[PDB]
Each structure stands twice: as C-alpha cells, then as structure tokens.
C-alpha cells in the first residue's frame, strides 16, 4: 500500500544557561529509524532500526552534519521569533518542524509537506503544490516573504519530489522484511460483570502494524456509539500497536453485539461476538 518518510524536530530554549535542547526523529511509516539528541554523548545521528545500520560511514557523516544544521537554524529561529513576538528572554519557548513525503502503492510521489510551529501553534507551512506558503500571522508573513525572495520552495520541492522518494524506496527495499510486512491485529473479547444487570464487553486488537485501525461496535447490525469507550491507539514497545473498545450492555444480551475490526492487514474486516 501507501508509504511515507517523515522527520520530526523539536527545539526547546533554556534561558537559564546554554543552548536549546534539540531532538530529531525520522520515521518510515510507523517505524522510527533514526534519532538525534543534543543531550546524548555521541553528538551523532543514531540508528533505531536494524535495516538502517547497513548504511556506510559517509551516510552517517552526512546525516550528522545535516541534523546539526537543522539544530542551529532552530536555535537562530528561537531568538528571531522571541523578538518578532516581543517576548522576554526569561521564558522557555519551543519550535517544532515536520517534513516528509508520501508515495502510493506504485512507490511514485504522491505528496510532500513541510510544516513549522512556535509554542505549539502553526507558524508557517508549505502548500500542497510545493510552490508557496501558508503563514498563520504577521510574523510568519515576514518569514514567508524572506523564503519567497530566497527561493526556498524550489529547493524543498526538489527534495520532496526527488531525493525523499528515492531514499524512501531504498529503505523500503532494505527493510523489506519488516517495512513491507503488515501484521494483522490479534483480537479477542473480554467480559466484565459491572453489576447483576449490566456487563461490559471489551474488544481487543493487539500486536498490529501499521498503527491505523478502526474498531466499531454494532447492536443488531447497526453502529453503536452510546455507552462505548475507545482508547487511543498505543505502542506496545516492540514496534506494534494496541487498541481496545468497550460497550456496556444489559446482562444476557451480549450476543446481539459485535465488534468490527478493519486494518490493512485484513482482507476482510473481522467480526467478534461474545460466546467464546
């Protein structure tokens, strides 16, 4: 199916002393493959998946130089934005950046994106055409004008439509054994007597990859929303994800309810119904 490569960058100013804390992560789909942290000892881009360890020392030299260039740009931006917004030098502020590309089934370019935030709010973002910018306020409007005069969109576009896709494909091929395997959710249902007259049924989806999934309850074949709870999708810690959904039901009416599970790794959605 579809794939993406995305990088995430966070910088947090430390007004009391020293430089900003900077953390960068890269992902292919829902798999983290690299990191950098300004507070770690290596001061290098580090692997976080086995299939990237393949890459030779020029890869790692290169990525390390680039990521440090990103941390310095953020450090300058933290000073510039504090002045554009007239804030004191006493407080800690945050800049966040995310960019990447998607490809379709065919592994051809589908879309690219590059977005930037200040203190948790949209600041500036590249538009879907990759030729122009969306600024959220008048400070970001100043940044937009600077980036337009400097032709930033052209060079991003060259990377989003070219380089990014080319490397995504190479990683998909090198990490084939995991990156192109989907892991269907392992499902089961639990039953909890809330009281003598009601019960809770909980539908579990475990150990699945990728993270995108839908769990929906039905009563006599129709969707039910009342009296349900759905937790956010959560990482298991071994690279797969977990989710569950629950519904409260009158005790003795369990057979009427069914949990439906949709996931890329499942040709047909699964249906679960209580009576093991």
């Amino acid at each position: 199916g579809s794939h993406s490569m995305r990088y995430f960058f966070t910088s947090v100013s430390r007004p009391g002393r020293g430089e900003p804390r900077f953390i960068a992560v890269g992902y292919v789909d829902d798999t983290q493959f690299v990191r950098f942290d300004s507070d770690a000892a290596s001061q290098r881009m580090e692997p976080r998946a086995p299939w990237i360890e393949q890459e030779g020392p020029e890869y790692w030299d290169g990525e390390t130089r680039k990521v440090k260039a990103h941390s310095q740009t953020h450090r300058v931006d933290l000073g510039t934005l504090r002045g554009y917004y007239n804030q004191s030098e006493a407080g800690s502020h945050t800049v966040q950046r995310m960019y990447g590309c998607d490809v379709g089934s065919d592994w051809r370019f589908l879309r690219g994106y590059h977005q930037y935030a200040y203190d948790g709010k949209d600041y500036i973002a590249l538009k879907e055409d990759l030729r122009s910018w969306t600024a959220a306020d008048m400070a970001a409007q100043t940044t937009k004008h600077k980036w337009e005069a400097a032709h930033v969109a052209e060079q991003l576009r060259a990377y989003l439509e070219g380089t990014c896709v080319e490397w995504l494909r190479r990683y998909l091929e090198n990490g084939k054994e995991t990156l192109q395997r989907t892991d269907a959710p392992k499902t089961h249902m639990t039953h909890h007597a809330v009281s003598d007259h009601e019960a809770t049924l909980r539908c579990w989806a475990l150990s699945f990859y990728p993270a995108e999934i839908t769990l929906t309850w039905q009563r006599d074949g129709e969707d039910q929303t009342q009296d349900t709870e759905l937790v956010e999708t959560r990482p298991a810690g071994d690279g797969t994800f977990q989710k569950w959904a629950a519904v409260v039901v009158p005790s003795g009416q369990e057979q009427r309810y069914t949990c439906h599970v949709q996931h890329e790794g499942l040709p047909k959605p699964l249906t679960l119904r209580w009576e093991p």
């Binding site: 680039k66 300058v76 931006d77 600041y123 380089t163």
Partner: peptide
C-alpha cells in the same frame, strides 16, 4: 535521508 540544512525564519 534528511533535507539540506534549512533556511532561518
């Protein structure tokens, strides 16, 4: 594979 070092705001 990271983009080249970005341009400052």
């Amino acid at each position: 594979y990271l983009a080249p070092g970005p341009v400052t705001a």
